[PDB]
Subunit: 237 residues, 4 copies
Amino acid sequence: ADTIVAVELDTYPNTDIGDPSYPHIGIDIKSVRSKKTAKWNMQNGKVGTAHIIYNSVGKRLSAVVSYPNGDSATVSYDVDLDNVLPEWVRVGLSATTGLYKETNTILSWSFTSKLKSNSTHETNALHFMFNQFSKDQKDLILQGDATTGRDGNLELTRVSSNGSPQGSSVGRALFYAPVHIWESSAVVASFDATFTFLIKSSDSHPADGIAFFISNIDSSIPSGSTGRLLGLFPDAN
Amino acid sequence: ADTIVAVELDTYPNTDIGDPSYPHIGIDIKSVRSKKTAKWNMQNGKVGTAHIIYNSVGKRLSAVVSYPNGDSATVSYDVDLDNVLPEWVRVGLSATTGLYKETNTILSWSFTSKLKSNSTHETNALHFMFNQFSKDQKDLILQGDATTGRDGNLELTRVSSNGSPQGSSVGRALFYAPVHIWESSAVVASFDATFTFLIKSSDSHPADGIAFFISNIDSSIPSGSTGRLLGLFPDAN
Amino acid sequence: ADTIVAVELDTYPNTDIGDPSYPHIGIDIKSVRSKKTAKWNMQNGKVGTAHIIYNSVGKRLSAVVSYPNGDSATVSYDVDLDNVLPEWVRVGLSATTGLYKETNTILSWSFTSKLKSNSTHETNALHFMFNQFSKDQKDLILQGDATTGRDGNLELTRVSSNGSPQGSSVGRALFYAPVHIWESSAVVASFDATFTFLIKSSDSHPADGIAFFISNIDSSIPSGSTGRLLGLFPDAN
Amino acid sequence: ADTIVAVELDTYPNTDIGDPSYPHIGIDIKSVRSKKTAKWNMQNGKVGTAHIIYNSVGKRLSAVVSYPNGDSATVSYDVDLDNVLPEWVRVGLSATTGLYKETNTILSWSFTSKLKSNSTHETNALHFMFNQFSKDQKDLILQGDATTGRDGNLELTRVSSNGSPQGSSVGRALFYAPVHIWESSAVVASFDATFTFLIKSSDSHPADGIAFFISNIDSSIPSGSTGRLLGLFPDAN
Ligand SMILES: OC[C@H]1O[C@H](Oc2c[nH]c3ccc(Br)c(Cl)c23)[C@@H](O)[C@@H](O)[C@@H]1O
Ligand SMILES: OC[C@H]1O[C@H](Oc2c[nH]c3ccc(Br)c(Cl)c23)[C@@H](O)[C@@H](O)[C@@H]1O
Ligand SMILES: OC[C@H]1O[C@H](Oc2c[nH]c3ccc(Br)c(Cl)c23)[C@@H](O)[C@@H](O)[C@@H]1O
Ligand SMILES: OC[C@H]1O[C@H](Oc2c[nH]c3ccc(Br)c(Cl)c23)[C@@H](O)[C@@H](O)[C@@H]1O
Ligand SMILES: [Ca+2]
Ligand SMILES: [Ca+2]
Ligand SMILES: [Ca+2]
Ligand SMILES: [Ca+2]
Ligand SMILES: [Mn+2]
Ligand SMILES: [Mn+2]
Ligand SMILES: [Mn+2]
Ligand SMILES: [Mn+2]
């Protein structure tokens, strides 16, 4: 199976798999059962911003999610990703719907990774930033139901012609280049990611959420990973 | 055929194809016959640095090549790359040898491209930096004789076990992700590239040189493009 | 007198000093009489974006001004700033009103300067970005009527309590740190600046405009430089 | 008194003030008595690199110091700098000698700070990088014995004509612009700093060390702060 590290913006409480009984943000290390969560007051129809930050010195993965009205939720977890992830990875965004649904619209996404070696003034780095997505966005690998270009956005899950989100959908977008996320001889390895999103739901309950994730380079959507599994995990272990 | 825009560091004068009778730097637009050149005093065995700069507003492609002793050569050419290149490209480094030879060793390479739209505060961008190259450098596409990892460097052309450059060699390295180099609706499109290199030759005449290039995404080494064609062009038209 | 290099967004045609008979953008080298101008269709009450770009290799100063509806104006001028400016400078924004008036509201401002030496991998650089301005913005030097903090913006010229722009006003904001804009031993010196602005006028004719400028470090508003002199020049020579 | 947060590279063990009995790196919050230290094997005459990293989400200040041979030391400390520092600060480097001495030579220094607001896509940021220091480095405030320009370096403490470090010396260099290090309404505030240094000593014991520090904007060298107080603190409380 794939190796997954993710920050989840989980809009639907699945208590059977350890979700608290409210929308929440979470840090997921090789399991959909978050290692740490925080209560998140998701604002229907508003544009939110998620920031994710990590460095190999502090060994603390942190995320904050905020809206323009100033409300925010944060979660941090002590983890040495050198000991979890493979050296080379791909990075991406994933989202799902299940019985319940929501738009999983990404308006922007940026990422920076740096490896600083012990050799003086020697750094390798990658940075990308998307503030618009075209219909043919060649530097993205789209999986599942994900599409680009609708109003210049990235729609991770299926939306009808009229804008209505569909159930039982899963989609992901991965940056085309592999990323060298750590190296044994690096003195510092760090990364940051930011994305903005618009989650909207008309009926009783948004679901299921959006995640930023880091995976093995050949990661694909696991079979049956719609709904609560967020397009990331093959089961809820 | 491919579409190529390149900055050449040409170490060997091929007067039959318009080279001046001295090593030179040149700007090549869809032809190995440079649109503009400047005399370049290549320092055998020293580490040089090339900087390449362009933006769609000024429409001027510029390059400077320097050594630590302060000697430098510069060349600029007025060109609207919006009207030359396809919208999506790959970027890379290329080098060759022919009857005569040299090491074509790359010690570092960085690149930044930005597309700034008319939509306020909306930019797409890509940046990468290599100061070391590993034996398995997954975010590079190596073509021809190019290898990575020897002393942490990128060797564009063939070098023997003992360090001796070989003749009739061609190799290229392209960044793995396609790059969105221009867009009709962009207000500014800009890019910059820098690389450091060590060209060394023992005998009578180094050849043939190193180039930074931008190509169609599916660009491959043209058949028979060793020596004076720099791994870039199928002929000298 | 000060030494000034500026990009002007000139909203009011003063034909006596060489303005064309329409709003225009211009490149000003040591004189308010622009070396080059382009027609600019200023959109009353809309947020515009100006980008300014220069490098010492190409020796071409360029500016583009755009609005979200896609309309833009561009101007470029060949100039070697190494031969014009002092080595150390301050950078800033300036605006004025005269008999006629407008809001000269700055919503964001960024700047990057880099000096790349002949010594391998040695660069000096400065970058700043403002997307909000507080009432006490300590890293700005405010001159004349300029204020910060009103709706988180920078108001270069005087606006009343009720939002009405006042006539005969001049104000500037300079970044607090001096900037090393060129150096004889640098192989490349480059800078970029971007700012977003909202110019609004109720009556017959907006005036007078906004400029991005680079000056001697001790630059101050010249006496009598309201109106057509843009807070930059002591006279119209 | 000033408010100081610092990372110390402490070359001389002063056990009376809580130093361990070996050279060490330490995190100092409002006291020279480090909150956390780690053993540091200082390599006489070699160029070291210090990286310092912090963000307001994770609330963990980290530092690593390394040499090209791969040896490194790291220290991290949980601290919410929002609750320690004033909103506006200056950042700098400090060093001292006492009865014993060493060169405190800085070869490069970079710093980045970012404030990301809850308003979507609104960030304020400052970045600077020095890889060479001139005799008149106008964007630095030099205090005490600090000088710039000797071999293009920053010498924090006094060195004679012939290169010999002098005792009882203290000097600091602060970036000229104040830095907005936190803001109550910011969702993320982060900073990073890196510097390279060459500490050399001829005799029995190097002393006293180098520190990266963040202070109130009007910070000056406290009276009597040579030697073990590192130019940072007025006493050893
Ligand atoms: O989209 C929200 C959820 O819908 C499904 O689970 C259900 C939530 N409430 C229900 C009520 C009845 C039935 Br049958 C089901 Cl499967 C569910 C499943 O698709 C879940 O994976 C998912 O998280
Ligand atoms: O490496 C330098 C050059 O060597 C070859 O051309 C020759 C340069 N001097 C010669 C002398 C004899 C013969 Br045969 C040849 Cl092909 C050459 C060719 O491989 C050229 O493409 C190349 O630029
Ligand atoms: O604000 C626009 C302009 O107003 C003034 O010039 C005039 C423009 N039309 C006028 C009509 C009458 C008189 Br008196 C004057 Cl000074 C002017 C002056 O303040 C100018 O410097 C300025 O550019
Ligand atoms: O430079 C190293 C140290 O030298 C001085 O302390 C001494 C270290 N060993 C000594 C031996 C004798 C005397 Br007197 C003194 Cl003050 C010292 C003092 O200047 C200290 O602050 C300093 O850390
Ligand atoms: Ca859930
Ligand atoms: Ca040639
Ligand atoms: Ca005018
Ligand atoms: Ca000590
Ligand atoms: Mn969950
Ligand atoms: Mn040539
Ligand atoms: Mn004008
Ligand atoms: Mn100590």
